[PDB]
């Protein structure tokens, strides 16, 4: 019988009590990254994260930091491999920058052979060290030209441009890559990119954020989400019909959260919590497992929710061999009004829920996850049991999928000096506490989870935060980015992997 | 009788001997800038100077510097006005960033109202201080989307997109702006952007520079130059047919140089020198005054030289109310082979001339203009009499045009500390020596020159050099860019203007 801790102090950092041998022998352990966050702009075209961070510098991070040079994994990809080799990792999730291999967006405009060679060398070097690549096609870095020609995922033209890009990736790299992810965290661009405008491309309703160049927070998240699903599904059909000889697997990435009632004896809070599961997870998982959006979304969102044609429904339903599930935290849910006629209405309001980390009796859900120095009541807190609840729910609600946990991690402040930053015991505690619950749900619920990739390999440009926070299991000095030095957490993870 | 010095020491920094009263009362004096170099990316889309400096950082400058933030004239435009007001300048040449007012390139995709407001406020503030704007529509910063859709000026699609952009500028700003420049230095993009790939977009033949993403140095300069001429001319026709009510004037900008024979008693060197005038100046001035390219270009360049249709010839011929002539230096010319079959052939080789600053008897043409620390034999030297020779030649060869000198200036090294940088006596000497000769050619040759705008208002991002050189008459601290402090040269120019 497995017992896992939910509150500090944690004791799961002792590899005598929790280690890779606690899991099945075939289980994959590694780390994750994304191309905008680590490579730098050298050698690639420009994408909407370049555009957004340059046009709206105060949304790039408090430091106005961006991905221009970052940790220079363009130059230092071998040093990334060396971290993975030091860890004895068996998996690495990275993304391909579309703008590196097709700078002009549309494949017929030509490819960047040198860009293709960069990924070929990375892939070869990973395989040579026994590391299985998990490759994300699209981690948000859409070529700027596509955004400017047709507003990117706002238009159905994205579908064919994404498909041609993916086809190029399968053709060039699929002989060696056997695990593909389509779109990172389906929820994120619709809501953050086209709802709140926290993220590229930065569209919203005028009264939501007067800085947005265009948009409609009430409608565009749904359009974008629908096109993401169709683009994803077209790519999965291409993969499975034209690249079956490669013997690989493909899936989307979901951002997952658990949700608990703000007040667990209040029917209204309980209802809000179930609405959140449908609006946050089901928005994408309903289409992926059934070809339709959740009924509560159909009912609430009304004419703002696009329909799938019968052909589209069939394409989207079942369009995965596995799911990449990212998990960071859990929220309490309580009712909230949905003012659809308000000029500042957003799609996120349609769930009719307000989300917190503190429940009605004042209980904070778990340890600190992210401090917000401008407003401490907005701090995020984590909840290790949430990974168990999420995986259990996916097995039960969504037809017992094959799952890889494709991100899980925690930041530490960029104001810490190097010594404090390397003594990242808070990261050991976060990682180990989640891994305890992940082992527990695999054993107790028989969820088909076959790997775990912690966020992040190294310190990088963090979307929305610049270099003001660090997520790496290895430290990078921003004054000289060559080295990636294992932190206490990297050292711990090394021992967890090879106890 | 006016006597001007050609060699150090100069004595023209004494405003008792040379000042604005030396010129006609209506003569305009000021300074110049360009949008990529001064504004920063905040509030605008991305352009090919963003793209080029990010994809090829070692071509942006030795420091890998770029225009991301630069002197932040987006924020500090009023401080630019204050410099001009301190100088008692009567003119200011600046450029409009296409990506600031139409981030998506094509006007039908929408305009950036806030971008338009930025130029409205600058224009209003200049006029309120009695400063005449001279506005460049296109100082090289093409929206990246246009380069990625159709390779920008490589394709005839540029013509209509440039025309719609210019129409927007005339409509929004032409009530107040009465002097417009179309394309900065017609020679520069074809040769540097598509020939040597020193400049955005960075296209060339593979063996010229293996880093270029695509191109053909032998053909593309001519295509690009031809499209620039047609785009320019379409804009001038639009201006003169649809905006005649505004009572303004429009013209192109030329980069001018003088050329002297490397050996002035060698017929081959003399012939190379005349070929250089045709290939460097006539490439554009032949079309602008006659609707045709120079005969030597027709003969040499052959099938690589595009033809104008009769309609196009008519559009281009006479397509200026004035010429903006930029002038920095003069070269000696000697014969050089033109290996048209070589894989590394460039359009610049077609002139059949090698250019130097030292003549056959070892004479350096004038004082140091730019030191090249990697190779001192490649230092540039200036030649004050060259501005007299250029203006004289334009009057005689090109039908007595109205001229404004739209750039003239010199750098000092970015390795100098602030005190050395502020004691920029070398810049006083360069500026005054050219102004002496400019007054001399107006008086002796009756060239219709009506203003002079020194490069640059302030220190900025220098194309190809980053922040490793400074051109300003006012100093900017890169650690805190708010202030623009008049250097010795700015102080001198203040006294020259108001002696
Ligand atoms: C899994 O996918 C299944 C589909 O493959 C989902 O089942 C569908 O659920 C639909 C409701 O979402 C249901 O459609 C309704 O059909 C009513 C019946 O119509 C038939 O007879 C009519 C009946 O009187 C007639 O007009 C029709 O022409 C048909 O003959 C019908 O009115 C409903 O429409 C109203 O409601 C929808 C909102 O739901 C409005 O958009 C619409 O304007 C109208 O006001 C609805 O019809 C659907 O209307 C929209 C149109 O685009 C659709 O094509 C039309 O179908 C549908 O019958 C079933 N299909 C079957 C095959 O069962 C299933 O839904 C879950 O399970 C069903 C039983 C129900 O409980 C749903 O609430 C649950 O979500 C999906 N499962 C999951 C878990 O999502
Ligand atoms: C100012 O613009 C003026 C034009 O508005 C320039 O004058 C033109 O100069 C052209 C040479 O560049 C000259 O064209 C030549 O015409 C020859 C005569 O053709 C007529 O009779 C033929 C004659 O036997 C016949 O085939 C034709 O159909 C006509 O009836 C002719 O062969 C020349 O073509 C050969 O040379 C050109 C290269 O120059 C090759 O490209 C071509 O394949 C061929 O091998 C040339 O014909 C032109 O050929 C190219 C085609 O695209 C053109 O349309 C065709 O015209 C033309 O006659 C005159 N036009 C007139 C009205 O004078 C003027 O040029 C300068 O002055 C002229 C006198 C001459 O000295 C030029 O060298 C000077 O540059 C321009 N001024 C300046 C300063 O540039
Ligand atoms: C978790 O949710 C539960 C269920 O909603 C909360 O319990 C409910 O709390 C209500 C107050 O928020 C109680 O109603 C009040 O009852 C007294 C007694 O008559 C009355 O004077 C109040 O006016 C009020 O009555 C309501 O007035 C509005 C009407 O529309 C409604 O019909 C009336 O009920 C309600 O009785 C109680 N329900 C139950 C089943 O206990 C619970 O609130 C916490 O516990 C309750 C017992 C009370 O001590 C609250 O102070 C305390 O907040 C909530 N838990 C938390 C921690 O918020
Ligand atoms: C400026 O250009 C002028 C004109 O080209 C240079 O003067 C010419 O310089 C040539 C040498 O580069 C002289 O030719 C040589 O003459 C001696 C006497 O016969 C002979 O032994 C050489 O072989 C050579 O002769 C040529 O050989 C190649 C044949 O194809 C050609 O037909 C022969 O002429 C040439 O006489 C002279 N021309 C004139 C009109 O003086 C001039 O060069 C400078 O001055 C000349 C006089 C000489 O002192 C050169 O050393 C010196 O460089 C050049 N000025 C400079 C500074 O380069
Ligand atoms: C968001 O786009 C929607 C749909 O075009 C706009 O909502 C409509 O508002 C128009 C004008 O009020 C109404 O006539 C329709 O009834 C509404 N349709 C629905 C589906 O709500 C909405 O105003 C736009 N929001 C913004 C801020 O522009
Ligand atoms: C530059 O483009 C030109 C024109 O397409 C190429 O020149 C031709 O070379 C082809 C193959 O040799 C020849 O058949 C033609 O005779 C040439 N045409 C002319 C106008 O020269 C040239 O090879 C390309 N250069 C590069 C480096 O690609
Ligand atoms: C691994 O952890 C398991 C408990 O899950 C323990 O039985 C085993 O001894 C540990 N392995 C090592 C080498 O410590
Ligand atoms: C941030 O920048 C935008 C311009 O993009 C401006 O609208 C906003 O007020 C600035 N934010 C703050 C907090 O100053
Ligand atoms: C498969 O590849 C062929 C050949 O390139 C293509 O034409 C066919 O339409 C593709 N199939 C997809 C997505 O099924
Ligand atoms: C608009 O929403 C903001 C936050 O979503 C809120 O502060 C404000 O009350 C809302 N305004 C109206 C008019 O509803
Ligand atoms: C930068 O870091 C690398 C790796 O430690 C080191 O080899 C190189 O000397 C360092 N350079 C400087 C300037 O610190
Ligand atoms: C690598 O992991 C494998 C599999 O558990 C183990 O046999 C090997 O000893 C480990 N290597 C190191 C250096 O830890
Ligand atoms: C201006 O220079 C002229 C010579 O060009 C001289 O006559 C005049 O005195 C000078 N003006 C002043 C105020 O020094
Ligand atoms: C500069 O960068 C390019 C890649 O854009 C590379 O080809 C070239 O060798 C580098 N230059 C030097 C001098 O190292
Ligand atoms: C003039 O403006 C009209 C109306 O917008 C336009 O349709 C006409 O073609 C334009 N003319 C040019 C460049 O002459
Ligand atoms: C190519 O040109 C370069 C410089 O233009 C020169 O060094 C070289 O000799 C040329 N090569 C050939 C094969 O002509
Ligand atoms: C930056 O320069 C401006 C102008 O001199 C000054 O007001 C401001 O205090 C300076 N800030 C710093 C941090 O130096
Ligand atoms: C400005 O220049 C005008 C025109 O020459 C002159 O009358 C006025 O005194 C000058 N102002 C200053 C402050 O120099
Ligand atoms: O914020 C940490 C990380 C980001 O760095 C990843 O790019 C993104 O996929 C994500 N989503 N949720 N949390 N994360
Ligand atoms: O190098 C100094 C300046 C550049 O800063 C200008 O942008 C450009 O128009 C130019 N051309 N020649 N010299 N210059
Ligand atoms: Zn940048």
Residue B77, beta-bridge partner list:
none
d(CA B322, CA A152): 43
Token pair 């493909």 is found at A250
SS3 category, A499? coil
Strands B474-477 and A353-356: unpaired
d(CA A197, CA A218): 12
Report residue B87 CA to chain centroid gap.
22
Residue of A262, A243, A264, A288 lying closest to A397 (CA atoms): A288
d(CA A402, CA B5): 83
B56, B59, B61, B63 alpha-carbon torsion, rounded to 10°: 50
A396 CB-contact burial (10 Å; exposed 0-12 / middle 13-18 / buried 19+): exposed
Tokens standing for B186?
A: 């017609």
B52, B141 contact by CB (below 8 A): no
d(CA A338, CA A336): 7
Residues with CB under 6 A from ligand 15: B 237-238, 241-242
Report residue A315 CA to chain centroid gap.
23
B469, B411 contact by CB (below 8 A): yes
d(CA A305, CA B301): 60
Residue of A350, A335, A354 lying closest to A302 (CA atoms): A350
For residue B337, count other CB atoms closer than 10 A to its CB: 9
Q: Given an 8 Å threshold on Cβ–Cβ distance, is B50 in contact with A54?
A: yes
B331: phi then psi, degrees, rounded to nearest 5: -125, 150
A109 CB-contact burial (10 Å; exposed 0-12 / middle 13-18 / buried 19+): middle
d(CA A38, CA A76): 10
C-alpha distance from A131 to closest chain B C-alpha (Å) = 29
Residue A135, beta-bridge partner list:
A94, A180
d(CA A486, CA A475): 6
B405: phi then psi, degrees, rounded to nearest 5: -80, 105
What's the CA-to-centroid distance between A410 and ligand 19, angstroms? 9
| B145 and A CB contact within 8 Å | yes
d(CA B335, CA B355): 9
For residue A306, the 8-state DSSP code is P
Mutate to test the pocket of ligand 1, among A290, A297, A309, A317 (most ligand atoms within 8 A of CB): A290
B227, B154 contact by CB (below 8 A): yes
d(CA B129, CA B176): 13
Please say if A151 is a catalytic residue.
no
Report residue B420 CA to chain centroid gap.
27
| B68 and A CB contact within 8 Å | yes
What's the CA-to-centroid distance between A298 and ligand 1, angstroms? 10
Q: Given an 8 Å threshold on Cβ–Cβ distance, is B213 in contact with A103?
A: yes
Using a 6 Å cutoff on CB, does residue B407 contact ligand 20? yes
For residue A164, count other CB atoms closer than 10 A to its CB: 16
DSSP E strands, A309-423: 323-335, 353-356, 368-370, 380-381, 402-407, 412-413
Residue B92, beta-bridge partner list:
B31, B133
In the set A220, A370, A407, A416, the catalytic residue is A407
By CA distance, what is B49's nearest residue in A? A46
For residue A277, count other CB atoms closer than 10 A to its CB: 20
Residue B480, beta-bridge partner list:
B477
Residue of A227, A48, A213 lying closest to A153 (CA atoms): A227
| A105 and B CB contact within 8 Å | yes
A101, A105, A106, A110 alpha-carbon torsion, rounded to 10°: -40
Residue of B410, B404, B406, B405 lying closest to B383 (CA atoms): B410
Token pair 């790997």 is found at A451
d(CA B258, CA B387): 8
Host H or E run for residue B335: strand B323-335
Size (chain A), residues: 499
d(CA A29, CA A19): 11
| Phi-psi region at B77: left, alpha or beta (left = phi > 0; alpha = psi -120 to 50) | alpha
Mutate to test the pocket of ligand 11, among A482, A484, A485 (most ligand atoms within 8 A of CB): A482
Using a 6 Å cutoff on CB, does residue A303 contact ligand 5? yes
Residue of B354, B429, B433, B351 lying closest to B386 (CA atoms): B433
Q: DSSP 3-state helix, strand, coil percentages of chain A (rounded to 5)?
A: 45, 20, 40
B365: phi then psi, degrees, rounded to nearest 5: -65, -25
Determination technique for this entry:
X-ray
Residue of A329, A328, A250 lying closest to A288 (CA atoms): A250
Tokens standing for A379?
A: 């701090």
**Do the annotations mark residue B139 as ligand-binding?**
yes
Residue B332, beta-bridge partner list:
B260, B356
Supply the DSSP string of B431-488, one letter for each residue.
HHHHHHHHHHHHHHH--EEEEEEEE-SB--PBTTTBTSEE--SEEEETTEEEEEEE-H
Tokens standing for A469?
A: 């926070």
DSSP E strands, B229-318: 249-251, 253-261
A173, A94 contact by CB (below 8 A): no
A343, A347, A353, A354 alpha-carbon torsion, rounded to 10°: -70
For residue B394, count other CB atoms closer than 10 A to its CB: 25
B181, B113 contact by CB (below 8 A): no
B153, B157, B160, B163 alpha-carbon torsion, rounded to 10°: -10
Give the up-direction half-sphere exposure of residue B164: CA atoms within 13 A in the CB hemisphere.
14
Q: Given an 8 Å threshold on Cβ–Cβ distance, is A104 in contact with B148?
A: yes
Tokens standing for B331?
A: 């070269």
Residue of B69, B14, B37, B150 lying closest to B411 (CA atoms): B37
Interface test with B, best of A42, A45, A46, A52 (most B CBs within 10 A): A46
Angle between helical axes of A488-497 and A425-445 (0-180°, round to 10)? 30
d(CA A277, CA B311): 66
Supply the DSSP string of B203-240, one letter for each residue.
---TTT-TT-SS--TTTHHHHHHHHHHHHHHHHHHHHH
B99, B45 contact by CB (below 8 A): yes
Residue of B390, B378, B387, B470 lying closest to B423 (CA atoms): B470
Could you give the domains of chain B? 1-499 (3.20.20.80)
A352, A346 contact by CB (below 8 A): no
d(CA B72, CA B37): 9
Strands B323-335 and B402-407: parallel
B200, B49 contact by CB (below 8 A): yes
B21, B23, B29, B34 alpha-carbon torsion, rounded to 10°: -160
Using a 6 Å cutoff on CB, does residue A343 contact ligand 10? no
Tokens standing for B11?
A: 């004595």
Residue of B178, B82, B170 lying closest to B125 (CA atoms): B82
Q: Given an 8 Å threshold on Cβ–Cβ distance, is A110 in contact with B214?
A: yes
- The H helix count followed by the E strand count for chain B is 19, 16
Scored b (16 or more CB within 10 A) or e, B251-274 reads: bbbbbbbbbbbbbeeeeebbbbbe
d(CA A418, CA A392): 39
B332 vs B261, B271, B276, B278, CA distance in Å? Answer: 5, 12, 10, 15
A162 vs A142, A154, A233, B118, B415, CA distance in Å? Answer: 10, 13, 11, 36, 47
For residue B197, the 8-state DSSP code is -
d(CA B471, CA B456): 6
* Sequence-separated contacts (24+) of A149-155 with Cβ below 8 Å: A149/A105, A149/B104, A149/B145, A149/B149, A151/A201, A151/A203, A151/A214, A152/A48, A152/A201, A153/A189, A153/A224, A153/A227, A153/A228, A153/A231, A154/A194, A154/A203, A154/A220, A154/A223, A154/A224, A154/A227, A155/A227
| A335 and B CB contact within 8 Å | no
Measured at the CA of A303, the angle between CA A298 and CA A309, to 5 degrees, comes to 70
d(CA B233, CA B226): 11
SS3 category, A323? strand
């Amino acid at each position: 019988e497995i017992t896992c801790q939910e509150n500090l102090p944690f004791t799961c950092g002792n590899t005598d009590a929790l280690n890779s041998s606690s899991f099945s022998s075939d289980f994959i352990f590694g780390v994750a990254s994304s191309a905008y966050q680590i490579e730098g702009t050298i050698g690639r075209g420009l994408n909407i994260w370049d555009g957004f961070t340059h046009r709206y510098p105060n949304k790039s991070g408090p430091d106005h930091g961006n991905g221009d040079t970052t940790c220079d994994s363009f130059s230092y990809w071998q040093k990334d491999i060396d971290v993975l080799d030091e860890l004895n990792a068996t998996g690495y999730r990275f993304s391909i920058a579309w703008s590196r291999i097709i700078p002009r967006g549309k494949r017929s405009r030509g490819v960047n052979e040198k860009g293709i060679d960069y990924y070929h060398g990375l892939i070869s070097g990973l395989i040579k060290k026994g590391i299985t690549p998990f490759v994300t096609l699209f981690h948000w870095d859409l070529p700027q030209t596509l955004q400017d020609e047709y507003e990117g995922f706002l238009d159905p033209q994205i579908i064919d441009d994404f498909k041609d890009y993916a086809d190029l990736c399968f053709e060039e790299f699929g002989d060696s890559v056997k695990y593909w992810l389509t779109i990172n965290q389906l929820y994120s661009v619709p809501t953050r990119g086209y709802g709140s405008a926290l993220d590229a491309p930065g569209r919203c309703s005028p009264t939501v954020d007067p800085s947005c160049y265009a948009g409609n927070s009430s409608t565009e998240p749904y359009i974008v989400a629908h096109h993401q699903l169709l683009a994803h599904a077209k790519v999965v059909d291409l993969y499975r019909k034209n690249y079956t000889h490669q013997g690989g697997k493909i899936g989307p990435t979901m951002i997952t959260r658990w949700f608990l009632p703000y007040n667990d004896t209040d029917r209204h809070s309980i209802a809000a919590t179930e609405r959140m599961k449908e609006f946050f997870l089901g928005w994408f998982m309903g289409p992926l497992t059934n070809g339709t959006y959740p009924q509560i979304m159909i009912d609430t969102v009304g004419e703002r929710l696009p329909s799938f044609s019968p052909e589209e429904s069939n394409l989207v339903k079942g369009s995965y061999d596995f799911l990449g599930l990212n998990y960071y935290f859990t929220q309490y849910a309580q009712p909230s009004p949905n003012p659809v006629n308000s000029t500042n209405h957003t799609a996120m309001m349609d769930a009719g829920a307000k989300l917190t980390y503190i429940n009605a009796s004042g209980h904070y859900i778990g340890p600190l996850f992210e401090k917000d120095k401008a407003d401490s009541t907005d701090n995020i807190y984590y909840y290790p049991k949430g990974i168990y609840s999420v995986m259990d729910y996916f097995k039960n609600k969504y037809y017992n999928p094959l799952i890889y946990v494709t991100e899980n991690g925690i930041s530490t402040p960029g104001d810490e000096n190097r010594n404090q930053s390397m003594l990242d015991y808070t990261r050991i505690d976060y990682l180990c506490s989640h891994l305890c619950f992940l082992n527990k749900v695999i054993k107790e619920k028989d969820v088909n989870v076959k790997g775990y990739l912690a966020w992040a390999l190294g310190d990088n440009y963090e979307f929305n935060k610049g270099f003001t926070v660090r997520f790496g299991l290895s430290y990078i000095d921003w004054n000289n980015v060559t080295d990636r030095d294992l932190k206490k957490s990297g050292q711990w993870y090394q021992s967890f992997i090879s106890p």
